[PDB]
Amino acid sequence: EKFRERLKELVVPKHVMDVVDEELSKLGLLDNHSSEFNVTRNYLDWLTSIPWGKYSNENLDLARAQAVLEEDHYGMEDVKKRILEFIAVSQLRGSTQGKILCFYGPPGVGKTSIARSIARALNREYFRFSVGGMTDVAEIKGHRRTYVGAMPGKIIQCLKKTKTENPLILIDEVDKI
Amino acid sequence: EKFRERLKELVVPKHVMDVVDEELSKLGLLDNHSSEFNVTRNYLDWLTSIPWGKYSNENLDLARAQAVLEEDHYGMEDVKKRILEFIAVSQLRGSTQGKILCFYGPPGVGKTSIARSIARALNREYFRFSVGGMTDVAEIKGHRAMPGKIIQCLKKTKTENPLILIDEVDK
Amino acid sequence: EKDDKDAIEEKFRERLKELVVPKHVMDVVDEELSKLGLLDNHSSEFNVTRNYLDWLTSIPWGKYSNENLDLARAQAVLEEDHYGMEDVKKRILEFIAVSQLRGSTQGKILCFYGPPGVGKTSIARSIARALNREYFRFSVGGMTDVAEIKGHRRTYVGAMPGKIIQCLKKTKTENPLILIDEVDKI
Ligand SMILES: Nc1ncnc2c1ncn2[C@@H]1O[C@H](COP(=O)(O)OP(=O)(O)OP(=O)(O)O)[C@@H](O)[C@H]1O
Ligand SMILES: Nc1ncnc2c1ncn2[C@@H]1O[C@H](COP(=O)(O)OP(=O)(O)OP(=O)(O)O)[C@@H](O)[C@H]1O
Ligand SMILES: Nc1ncnc2c1ncn2[C@@H]1O[C@H](COP(=O)(O)OP(=O)(O)O)[C@@H](O)[C@H]1O
Ligand SMILES: [Mg+2]
Ligand SMILES: [Mg+2]
B-C contacts (CB, under 8 Å): 6
B171 touches chain C (CB under 8 A): no
- Label the pairing between strands B163-167 and B126-130: parallel
CB distance from B35 to chain C under 8 Å?
Answer: yes
**CB of A137 within 8 Å of any CB in chain B?**
no
First and final C-alpha spacing in chain C: 51
* Contact between B56 and B161 (Cβ < 8 Å): yes
For residues A95 and C16, what is the distance between their CA atoms, to the nearest angstrom?
77
Residue B113 CB less than 6 A away from ligand 1: yes
Paired with C137 in beta bridges are: C179
Residue A112 annotated as binding site: yes
Neighbours of C82 (CB within 10 A): 14
| Amino acid type, B166 | I
- Rounded to whole angstroms, the maximal C-alpha distance in chain A is 62
Rounded-to-integer distance, Cα C85 and Cα C120, Å: 10
Q: Rounded to an integer, what distance in angstroms lies between the CA atom of residue B48 and that of residue B51?
A: 7
Is the distance from CB of A48 to CB of A79 less than 8 angstroms? no
Q: Is B53 helix (H, G, I), strand (E, B) or coil?
A: coil
Beta bridge partners of C139: C181
Instruction: List the beta bridge partners of residue B87.
Output: none
Closest CA to B79 of B127, B128, B126, B117: B117
The protein residue with its alpha carbon nearest to ligand 2, atom 20, reads C117
Chain A contacts of B137, Cβ < 8 Å? 148-149
Q: Which residues lie across from A127 on neighbouring strands?
A: A169
**Chain B CB within 8 Å of residue C155 CB:** yes
Chain B residue numbers touching C38 (CB-CB < 8 A): 31, 33
Cα(A17)–Cα(A48) distance, integer angstroms = 10
Distance CA(C173)–CA(C177), nearest Å, equals: 10
What residues in C contact B33, CB-CB < 8 Å? 34-35, 38
Residue list for the binding site of B: 105-112
